């Protein structure tokens, strides 16, 4: 039972580490995506301002 | 013959061919597993067979053998165990077996013996419930691999019969299995007379603990039950092989019919195109 | 060191060599040793015991027979059970017998084959214009 | 209809036997000396059908919704007239004799009745999900009915027997009391919104409808209306 | 990756009449039928949801190799719809790694092979189907 | 002795599991930073491209 | 090609999809206004097929031998276009997909492919005898293709088991390395003369090479190549 518990605990610790890794990577991805969307929106607004300047 | 109804016929016959092909595959697989079951059952029957040989080599006393091993002289009443596949499509086996039941029920009825019948299967249960020979015993819903427990419900009664005197013999009509393509029907005697060549038994001697009489009286019903079980398993294997052969023949016939219908459909298609272009050219001109 | 075979009308249970057989003969329990004299006995509902190198396996037998040659032992028992396993139920032997067997081994077979026959019969009615 | 559509009002137009329109054109062409096309049909088949089926559309002001009737010669959907009609169809409703003779007042067959709107992008994910949940227990058309015929359900099915119960309940529930028939059968007409229909069928498929017997869904507008009946 | 997909789909099509009799069949035939059913359910796709080349390659690599065998057939589609999402969020680097060497003659190069294997194992360990 | 060394090996395995968890989390943090930087740089370059095409 | 034929040379003319030539003739006839014949075919179908494929003859000076791909409309070998093509054909080669899926590149289906010249009075009695026996064992193998999948090779009787074993070996031996495929496969092409082919296949059938497995017959030349390889 101690060998079985060692295997189970190793697998559980690795799985929890991978879950934390996935969570933090997902948070970074969503933050980067929202900041990218903000930058794109600002660029589009500046382009519309340039069009109004041309008009 | 309108180039579209022929297409429906082709589709229907192709569906028939596909269903028949699937049934043929599964019948082949179930025949293989039934053959495996028969092979697994062989050692028990063989062992009890030389046990019969040895014990019958002894206790030859007619009074001692008055129990089951006895041969009723009058033979006034007889019984037939018929094992018939439960579902059809089997081919000619269901009929070949129910016919030999007749040849027997007659040749016997002709001996003045009152022939009765215990049937394993719904196909048999009916041929006789119709003929009027309500099966003295009917075992239906028989699976590819039944257990000896099943045949017991009927074999107990047939045996209690050869003991109640109600019968003077028990034959089983079952479907043998000679080749993966052949499945001749066959009859076997169920009276446990035994007594093979003294050479077969080798006269092996034992110290029968409960007694020779008790061992014989408790072993003969088990021997006939084992014979019935072996016959039922061989019948199941022959049923599956016959169904496989019948579905192979039906698939070949369906493929030939598909080819003929394809030729007819193509002729109708060419005729339809010719008629259409002819009437279009006539309308143009 | 005697060639024991627990055979059954369905299948063979054991075919190994065994030290001791604590057979439940009808008159009374009988032990068997590698050179036992020829014998033929009727069993009663009980728990036959197989002694194999000091290990006792309690095969319950609800009935059956036994032939004891000097060199081999054959048990033509009606039913042989191993309650010692206990988990046999949870084990596929019974657990699968409940689902992997009968449920799909038979019920599913019957359903599929009957459905195939039904589709065949319906389409053979539908083709009754050729 | 287009006069009223110009006012912004919604119009429902029933062109009964639109196929007889096509046939008419064929004759008009044959007597006009036009060169025949395909099986005697007019060369201007697609354009003639378009000039009629394109005025049936939803503009900003109003919409002319059309529910036509199509008669296929013999049973040939390959024929040019049914094919041209189907090229301009958005939905098919298959009324059946079997459903009608079972006292199911709306004889619309749950199967063989398609619509290109039935995708999650337009109706909604829940509407599509339930509409696929139903017509799936009937995808087999209760194919169990064939098995019941030669097995008697094998006495009972391991779980199929439930599916049969749900299928019968929903088939009964498809029926609805109509207001126009209110003075014939003496039963008030029930108007059921699409949201009510989707919610009712979804909740019935979850199993809330496993407590009421059949014939309690026989002519009732919503699942809630079935419940009121069970409580009373 | 798609060669084994095509071969297994052809084998399933040869046995397509046998799906409803899969129980009463050979073990290899049942395995082929089950794999074909899984692949056919994998090919099923919703509308307006095109999958990029790296996502298709990842899913087909997971399918051709014995990784969807434990997943039941009705959930195979769902499995895909989850797995790619996992690769879209948990492991964005493996998708780029697949897309970068998609033109390599020996595409399952050890680096991408280990990356994809690890991603599939990590997804299967966390999820239950 | 087998039980003693099994307990010792279980302790060593759980320590290795914690070490691997730390390594995995550190690698995930590095990947998250790299991916955020790449996404932000791509967004900035795209914004510049939109401004140039607007001009 | 007739210029080279007139110089005494022997020419091979490869016409891809002669049915497309037939279709072009039909379209030209329809455009010209000529009355249609049978299934949308030109009235001058036989005459047009005779203007072609009649200059493809073996004259005194030279010979033009033509291989013509033929597309069969639907699957009709009785359709007027393939019928008129067949009326002018001396040999048919039927490439088949399954024979090519296994890497037998010369994927000629021996049972389907026939030829008029395969008669004793032209190719010789020995050539005719071996060719028929080659087809006979292959035809027996095709009949047993079902049975082998039915029960396994075990049920097959002996001799029949030999014919299946021999038939697989001979159909593998139908493979042959090609000089034009030398650079792709890295295997030199082998030109096997007709007499050498007849001797090799007769010596394969009579019993020689039976001990040799199915391999060593794959992509080889004469029987001499199959043995030399087995020794090495």
Curated annotation (Swiss-Prot), chains A, F:
Protein localization: Cell membrane
Source organism superkingdom: Bacteria
Disulfide bonds: none
Function: F(1)F(0) ATP synthase produces ATP from ADP in the presence of a proton or sodium gradient. F-type ATPases consist of two structural domains, F(1) containing the extramembraneous catalytic core and F(0) containing the membrane proton channel, linked together by a central stalk and a peripheral stalk. During catalysis, ATP synthesis in the catalytic domain of F(1) is coupled via a rotary mechanism of the central stalk subunits to proton translocation.
Assembly with partners or alone: F-type ATPases have 2 components, F(1) - the catalytic core - and F(0) - the membrane proton channel. F(1) has five subunits: alpha(3), beta(3), gamma(1), delta(1), epsilon(1). F(0) has four main subunits: a(1), b(2) and c(10-14). The alpha and beta chains form an alternating ring which encloses part of the gamma chain. F(1) is attached to F(0) by a central stalk formed by the gamma and epsilon chains, while a peripheral stalk is formed by the delta and b chains.
Protein family (similarity comment): Belongs to the ATPase B chain family.
Protein name: ATP synthase subunit b
Lineage: Bacteria, Bacillati, Chloroflexota, Chloroflexia, Chloroflexales
Gene this protein is translated from: atpF
Span within the parent record: 56 to 110 of 164
Swiss-Prot record, chain C:
Cross-referenced Gene3D superfamilies: F0F1 ATP synthase delta/epsilon subunit, N-terminal
GO molecular function, one term: ATP binding
Sorted UniProt keywords: ATP synthesis, Cell membrane, CF(1), Hydrogen ion transport, Ion transport, Membrane, Transport
Lineage: superkingdom: Bacteria
Localization terms from the record: Cell membrane
Main location class: membrane
Cellular component GO terms held in the UniProt record: plasma membrane; proton-transporting ATP synthase complex
Region (Disordered): 88-109
Membrane topology note: Peripheral membrane protein
Pfam families in the record: ATP-synt_DE, ATP-synt_DE_N
GO biological process terms held by the UniProt record: proton motive force-driven ATP synthesis
Residue runs in coiled coils: none
Annotated InterPro entries: ATP_F1_dsu/esu_C_sf, ATP_synth_F1_dsu/esu, ATP_synth_F1_dsu/esu_N, ATP_synth_F1_esu_C, ATPsynth_dsu/esu_N
Subunit: F-type ATPases have 2 components, CF(1) - the catalytic core - and CF(0) - the membrane proton channel. CF(1) has five subunits: alpha(3), beta(3), gamma(1), delta(1), epsilon(1). CF(0) has three main subunits: a, b and c.
PANTHER family the UniProt entry points to: ATP SYNTHASE DELTA/EPSILON CHAIN, ATP SYNTHASE EPSILON CHAIN, CHLOROPLASTIC
Functional description taken from the UniProt entry: Produces ATP from ADP in the presence of a proton gradient across the membrane.
Family from the record: Belongs to the ATPase epsilon chain family.
NCBIfam families hit by this protein: ATP_synt_epsi, PRK13446.1, PRK14735.1
Protein name (database record): ATP synthase epsilon chain
Organism this protein belongs to: Chloroflexus aurantiacus (strain ATCC 29366 / DSM 635 / J-10-fl)
Lineage: Bacteria, Bacillati, Chloroflexota, Chloroflexia, Chloroflexales
UniProtKB/Swiss-Prot annotation, chains D, G:
Keyword Transport: yes
Keyword terms of this UniProt record: ATP synthesis, ATP-binding, Cell membrane, CF(1), Hydrogen ion transport, Ion transport, Membrane, Nucleotide-binding, Translocase, Transport
Quaternary data: F-type ATPases have 2 components, CF(1) - the catalytic core - and CF(0) - the membrane proton channel. CF(1) has five subunits: alpha(3), beta(3), gamma(1), delta(1), epsilon(1). CF(0) has four main subunits: a(1), b(1), b'(1) and c(9-12).
Subcellular location, record wording: Cell membrane
Major localisation: membrane
Protein name: ATP synthase subunit beta
Family: Belongs to the ATPase alpha/beta chains family.
Function: Produces ATP from ADP in the presence of a proton gradient across the membrane. The catalytic sites are hosted primarily by the beta subunits.
GO molecular function: ATP binding; ATP hydrolysis activity; proton-transporting ATP synthase activity, rotational mechanism
Lineage, broadest ranks: Bacteria, Bacillati, Chloroflexota, Chloroflexia, Chloroflexales
Primary gene name: atpD
GO cellular component: plasma membrane; proton-transporting ATP synthase complex
Keyword Membrane: yes
Swiss-Prot record, chain E:
Localization per record: Cell membrane
Function recorded in the entry: Produces ATP from ADP in the presence of a proton gradient across the membrane. The alpha chain is a regulatory subunit.
Entry's family note: Belongs to the ATPase alpha/beta chains family.
Subunit structure of this chain's protein: F-type ATPases have 2 components, CF(1) - the catalytic core - and CF(0) - the membrane proton channel. CF(1) has five subunits: alpha(3), beta(3), gamma(1), delta(1), epsilon(1). CF(0) has four main subunits: a(1), b(1), b'(1) and c(9-12).
Name the record gives this protein: ATP synthase subunit alpha
Source organism of this protein record: Chloroflexus aurantiacus (strain ATCC 29366 / DSM 635 / J-10-fl)
Gene: atpA
Full protein: residues contained: 393 to 521 of 522
